[PDB]
Design a protein around this ligand. Structure first.
Ligand SMILES: CCCCCCCCCC(=O)O
Ligand SMILES: [Cl-]
Length: 162
């Protein structure tokens, strides 16, 4: 795979707290298409553990309902890159953040050709941050994305952005 945008000097303890999935993009349409597509996940909160792992609370559509999830992303030697345990190796990379307004991250299946990738623009507040979106869109220029979604403040205050 392919994301070579990573934040230098990341302090993971400082991303802790409330986030909103303002926008999402993926390499393949089917990753985000359906309400229950695999990477259509809505971030609720980031909880870095005191040993530097990253616990992720999120919502996902799974029954005919919005199910809650807890994902644990384990630290690696690279401060901006974490690994989620599965039948396959898949990583979380933090591309950019200011901790207090926005965070840009991607998730990719490692590895390899390249294939499969989804990125989000996270913001602290249920508001459309055009500047965070502009940085998201800048980051995505380097990537082979084929679907992009964006949410309005009303959806951002609903479960699964309904
Ligand atoms: C630093 C932002 C962390 C958010 C990463 C969300 C990972 C969800 C991957 C999944 O379970 O499909
Ligand atoms: Cl790490």
């Amino acid at each position: 795979l392919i994301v070579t945008q990573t934040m230098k000097g990341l302090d993971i303890q400082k991303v802790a707290g409330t986030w909103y999935s303002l926008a999402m993009a993926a390499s393949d349409i089917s990753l985000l298409d359906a309400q229950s597509a695999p990477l259509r996940v809505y971030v609720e909160e980031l909880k870095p553990t005191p040993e530097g792992d990253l616990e992720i609370l999120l919502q996902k559509w799974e029954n005919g309902e919005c199910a809650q999830k807890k994902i644990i992303a384990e630290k690696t030697k690279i401060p901006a890159v974490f690994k989620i345990d599965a039948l396959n190796e898949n990583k979380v990379l933090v591309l950019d953040t200011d901790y207090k307004k926005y965070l840009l991250f991607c998730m990719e299946n490692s590895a390899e050709p390249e294939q499969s990738l989804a990125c989000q623009c996270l913001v602290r507040t249920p508001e459309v941050d055009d500047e965070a979106l502009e940085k998201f869109d800048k980051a995505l220029k380097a990537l082979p994305m084929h679907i992009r979604l964006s949410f309005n403040p009303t959806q951002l205050e609903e479960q699964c952005h309904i």
